[PDB]
Amino acid sequence: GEVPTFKLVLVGDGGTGKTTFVKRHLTGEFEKKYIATIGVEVHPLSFYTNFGEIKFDVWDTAGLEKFGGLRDGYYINAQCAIIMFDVTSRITYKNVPNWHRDLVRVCENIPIVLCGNKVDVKERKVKAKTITFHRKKNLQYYDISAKSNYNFEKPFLWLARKLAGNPQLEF
């Protein structure tokens, strides 16, 4: 009988590494063929902390193919979300404020951390001084590694901090 239950909804444009992100958090491997992620799926994941193993919910929301618009339905009752962006294109960065406006019209405050995938490439387009929107909009930022699994647990640790607020939550 585990008491701490927390639903997590991931947000981002389709085909932006979200499926790879969740599948790497499942077992830690990359699958080569690209399939446009459609629909939604649940991946019950429990991670170890000082309070034991804590279970979490996953919502594999993606796919701008269906005629019917249901993208806004998943946004209800969610208390946490994570945002992606690509480092090789300006469109993701200029779409970040659109994601900000839609999330704020969803809820007035939700802990959100800016995260950008596909950093394993040796050449990097989005140079660091460009990344200033989150600071002035009061959004926290972590980085993710596509190979070394850097920040594999620490974004979730930050999520745990915001869930509890007591700084004694450790690995």
Binding site: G39, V40, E41, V42, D57, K66, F67, G68, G69, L70, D72, G73, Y75, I76, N77, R105, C107, E108, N109, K122, E123, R124, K125, A128, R135, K136, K137, N138, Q140, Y141, S148, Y150
Partner: protein, 1016 residues
């Protein structure tokens, strides 16, 4: 309506996969026939959890469904919105209804819904609290809906603000009011009553209450406050210190997330860049420094080691550049504080706090000191230029002996920004600090490539600017990188070592000879390499070998014999433009050095060059790669014999098609690549080919000229104006009268280019604005003027009395504006130089013009500058041997020229030009002249230590036997004083040595010639 809610009750928690795939059947196809409310609103009366996204779907539908909606469809919705406002049970539900009201307020604009105004009055009165806060939130969202449509209501809203001043109550009401003024801020009134105040105590109390409640609410309060000030607000200026004092003293509450510090410091920075003159009136800096000093030396409450305190730190190999910790953005905040204000005396004012910061016993005090050096380190060092130029030359050394070893890194960084911010100070008392720094850095080869990389970046960087000074430093530096050179270590160590080798190579140019044979073995080892994981080291070694080839040439023939194919061979293993960077430069330089030596590897290299620009990469930016390849063809202009004759047609036309592209830098690269074909064809033709080759290359020149001609005025831009100007000057300097074949470039081109300069310029525009992203744009156009200095002389000396020769007269009146006493010394120097080439280019026709312009030259006379006007000073001479009869017109004007000013002489240049001009005047004709007098005076003050252009005067005066002999002892003593010196032109042959044979010189030797010249 029944089945929908039944689906929702089960699909809300975790839905179903099959229910996820249902979608369109779950949507129930919408099927809108009329759908007023029954299948369009579901009566809006159920459990609100469904009702939020029900309203969301209604919004999505109505965003497009309003094409046939009837009139009896708006009163119903607004009445239902009012009922929902009265029927509220949850905060999120109220938020959703407010959002729906704001987003249904999207159209029909004004002139509608009086009931919102009546609700506005109700909320202003609103003795009941919860309905008051709901009214405040709905007014806030409707204001958010329309940014500035209700300008007349602004006063009303401002008057509404007065009521909001009266209730310092529930935190929700304060949050609503401040987020309301958040959207109010973009109104930018700046003209309403300045009496709008008392908001400061309310926001102080709001953030005070939110410290234990929520950090973020005060956050949005502060960016709201920051957005409030954007223009000349009449009320913020008088009382501003109180809010910053409050925010810092509440930041002294360490029991808070660092975001509090983040946005107090950013709000302070914006307050400063808005204005910073208030601190002139009151001493607000010292309290700020006392406040931030604990921040600079902040200590974790549990003593937790910093992320920079880990010994290993083997993560994030590529690059990190994090700055979220308080110390970093604190040091950038204080640095922008320092740089934003003028120097004045603030640095001497903070010195008494500086030696207080200098107490460094605890390591945290040591980081505090290194950070105060970091902030003091600025672009302008005028304060440190005059006082304590080596201000702390041993404290930086005392920081090396630090067990915490982070003070060493901080000192390394500080020396970094000293190197690339204080240019004059790189030539200072560094005679002893550099070797010990190198020694202790190479004394710790623990494998931490981060410290080695930052050392390589910060060191061996400014010394390259010092050319003569680095030779005494040649030996020791080797036993620095040989500490890790060619030793088993990480590839990062190898790339660092080879980059440093390139750095000292640049610093030492051709002075590498004494120890270079020891670099022969390293070069042979590293060049004969290659592995599946050693790409970056091989690439960097490639461009550093290119730098070696550029720096030292002919002495490298034994080294130049190889590398013709060994480096070339290692390209087929992997195909990548990144892998192909700078590869063209090395073989290009090899071709330039060999001449015909590239004949064996001449065709395959051409094919590999061809298969670099055909790639459709483009067809701060990813396209920059192309530029590199483009630069390759530039070197082809140096020396390629005539092997490119069939190759040129293979590329040029495609390169022609590359002159047009939206990207500016690729256009600049293409244009500078075009700028070298003139030299290529000219060097091909000078090496005597057959006459058919001459005709073919002349036809090529004729077809290529219009490509340059079309760019004389078609361009509408600033950045490429320079490039086109030097390219046209070079192509004109790379040719001659053969470019004069089309009789349209003689006057029309010259007139167009003259009209382009100064006024009537295509670029000199002001009506258009900059809606795109801007840049530094530091008014480069002014320098363009002096760049135009080389525009005139290009083929200027090619008419000599042609039909277009008296064309400069069209530009003559504008030059008058140059000589008016309303410009700077640079403008006068530009004008006098330009007139110098115009007068030296032509003859009698220009001689009469300059004769008529002589009163202007006399008006210029002698200004207060050691190096101005010298161009005309020798211009009188150059016209003295020019013109002919115009020179004979004005002998009295020619002689004299306010000669007594030789006593005023302070600079060598003006003396040399005066002497040369007078020599030309004297030797123009063997006639009477001042002779012994001015001649003796100029001989007396004749060191001629820097007359690097007027050896021709000395050569021509020699053996030119008017009067004879003249003052022989003076010239004899002067030439004996000159004596054997550095490299000299053919001037010195027949320097009156044989004329001694005269009799007086032999009998009366000048002082004592036997000291060095016993016989000769």
């Amino acid at each position: 309506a029944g089945l929908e809610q039944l689906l929702r009750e089960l699909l809300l928690p975790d839905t179903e996969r099959i229910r996820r795939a249902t979608e369109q059947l779950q949507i129930v196809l919408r099927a809108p026939a009329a759908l007023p409310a029954l299948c369009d609103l579901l009566a809006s009366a159920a459990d609100p959890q469904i009702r939020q996204f029900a309203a969301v779907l209604t919004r999505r539908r109505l965003n497009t469904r309003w094409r046939r909606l009837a009139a009896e469809q708006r009163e119903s919705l607004k009445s239902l919105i009012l009922t929902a406002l009265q029927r509220e049970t949850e905060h999120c539900v109220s938020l959703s209804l407010a959002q729906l009201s704001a987003t249904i307020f999207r159209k029909e604009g004004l002139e509608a819904w009086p009931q919102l105004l009546q609700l506005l009055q109700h909320s202003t009165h609103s003795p009941h609290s919860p309905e008051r806060e709901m009214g405040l939130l709905l007014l806030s969202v409707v204001v958010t809906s329309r940014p500035e449509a209700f300008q007349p209501h602004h006063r009303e809203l401002l008057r509404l603000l007065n009521e909001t001043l009266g209730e310092v109550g529930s935190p929700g009401l304060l949050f609503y009011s401040l987020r309301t003024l958040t959207t109010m801020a973009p109104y930018l009134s700046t003209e309403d009553v300045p009496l709008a105040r008392m908001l400061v105590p309310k926001l102080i109390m709001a953030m005070q209450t939110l410290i234990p409640i929520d950090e973020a609410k005060a956050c949005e309060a502060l960016e709201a406050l920051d957005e409030l000030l954007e223009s000349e607000v009449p009320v913020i200026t008088p009382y501003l210190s109180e809010v910053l004092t409050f925010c810092l003293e509440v930041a002294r509450n360490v029991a808070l997330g660092n975001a509090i510090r983040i946005r107090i410091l950013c709000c302070l920075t914006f307050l400063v860049k808005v204005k910073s003159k208030a601190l002139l009136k009151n001493r607000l800096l010292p309290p700020l420094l006392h406040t931030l000093f604990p921040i600079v030396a902040a200590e974790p409450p549990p003593g937790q080691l910093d992320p920079e305190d880990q010994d290993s730190e083997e993560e994030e190999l590529e690059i990190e550049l994090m700055g979220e910790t308080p110390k970093h953005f604190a040091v950038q905040v204080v640095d922008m504080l320092a740089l934003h204000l003028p120097p004045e005396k603030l640095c001497p004012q903070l010195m008494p706090m500086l030696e207080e910061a200098l107490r460094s016993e605890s390591p945290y005090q040591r980081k505090a000191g290194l950070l105060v050096l970091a902030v003091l380190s600025d672009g302008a060092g005028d304060h440190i230029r005059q006082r304590l130029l080596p201000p702390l030359l041993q404290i930086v050394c005392k920081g090396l002996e630090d067990p915490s070893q982070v003070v060493r890194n901080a000192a390394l960084f500080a020396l970094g920004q000293f190197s690339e911010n204080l240019q004059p100070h790189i030539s200072s008392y560094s005679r002893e600090v550099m070797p010990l720094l190198l020694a202790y850095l190479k004394s710790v080869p623990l494998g931490h490539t981060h410290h080695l990389a930052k050392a390589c970046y910060a060191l061996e960087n400014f010394v390259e600017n010092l050319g003569p000074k680095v030779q005494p430093y040649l030996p020791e530096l080797m036993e620095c990188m040989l500490q890790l050179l060619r030793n088993p270590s990480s590839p990062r160590a190898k790339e660092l070592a080879v980059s440093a080798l390139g750095a000292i190579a640049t610093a030492a140019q051709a002075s590498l000879l004494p120890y270079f044979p020891a670099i022969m073995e390293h070069l042979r080892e590293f060049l004969l390499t290659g592995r599946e994981d050693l790409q970056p080291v091989q690439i960097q070694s490639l461009e550093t070998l290119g730098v070696l080839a550029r720096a030292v040439g002919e002495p490298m023939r034994p080294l130049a014999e190889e590398c013709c194919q060994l480096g070339l061979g290692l390209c087929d293993q992997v195909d990548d433009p990144d892998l192909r960077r700078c590869t063209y430069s090395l073989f290009a330089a090899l071709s330039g050095l060999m001449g015909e030596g590239l004949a064996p590897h001449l065709e395959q290299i051409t094919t590999l060059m061809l298969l670099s620009l055909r790639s459709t990469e483009g067809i701060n930016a990813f396209f920059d790669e192309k530029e590199d390849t483009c630069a390759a063809v530039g070197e082809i202009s140096v020396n390629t014999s005539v092997a490119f004759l069939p190759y040129m047609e293979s590329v040029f036309e495609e390169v022609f098609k590359l002159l047009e592209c939206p990207h500016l830098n690729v256009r600049k690269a293409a244009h500078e690549a075009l700028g070298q074909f003139c030299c290529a064809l000219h060097k091909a033709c000078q090496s005597c080919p057959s006459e058919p080759n001459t005709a073919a290359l002349q036809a090529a020149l004729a077809r290529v000229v219009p490509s340059y001609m079309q760019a004389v005025n078609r361009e509408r831009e600033r950045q490429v104006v320079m490039a086109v100007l030097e390219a046209l000057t070079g192509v004109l300097r790379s040719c001659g009268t053969l470019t004069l074949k089309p009789p349209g470039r003689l006057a029309e081109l010259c007139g167009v280019l003259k009209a382009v300069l100064q006024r009537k310029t295509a670029c000199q525009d002001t009506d258009e604005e900059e809606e795109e992203e801007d840049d530094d744009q530091a008014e480069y156009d002014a320098m363009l003027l002096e760049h135009a200095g080389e525009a005139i002389p290009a083929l200027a000396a090619a008419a000599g009395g042609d039909s277009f020769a008296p064309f400069f007269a069209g530009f003559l009146p504008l030059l008058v504006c140059k000589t008016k006493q309303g410009c700077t010394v640079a403008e006068k120097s530009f004008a006098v130089g330009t007139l110098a080439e115009t007068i030296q280019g032509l003859g009698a026709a220009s001689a009469q013009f300059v004769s008529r312009l002589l009163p202007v030259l006399l008006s210029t006379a002698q200004e207060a500058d050691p190096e101005v006007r010298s161009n005309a000073i020798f211009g009188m001479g150059v016209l003295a041997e020019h013109g002919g009869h115009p020179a004979q017109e004005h002998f009295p004007k020619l002689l004299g020229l306010l000669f007594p000013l030789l006593a005023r002489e302070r600079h060598d240049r003006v003396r040399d030009n005066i002497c040369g001009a007078l020599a030309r005047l004297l030797m123009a004709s063997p006639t009477r002249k001042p002779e012994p007098q001015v001649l003796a005076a100029l001989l007396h003050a004749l060191p001629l230590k820097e007359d690097l252009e007027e050896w021709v005067t000395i050569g021509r005066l020699f053996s030119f036997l008017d009067q004879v002999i003249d003052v022989a002892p003076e010239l004899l003593r002067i030439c004996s004083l000159i004596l054997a010196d550095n490299k000299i032109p053919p001037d010195t042959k027949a320097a009156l040595l044989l004329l001694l044979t005269f009799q007086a010189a032999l009998g009366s030797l000048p002082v004592d010639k036997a000291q060095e010249l016993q016989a000769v």
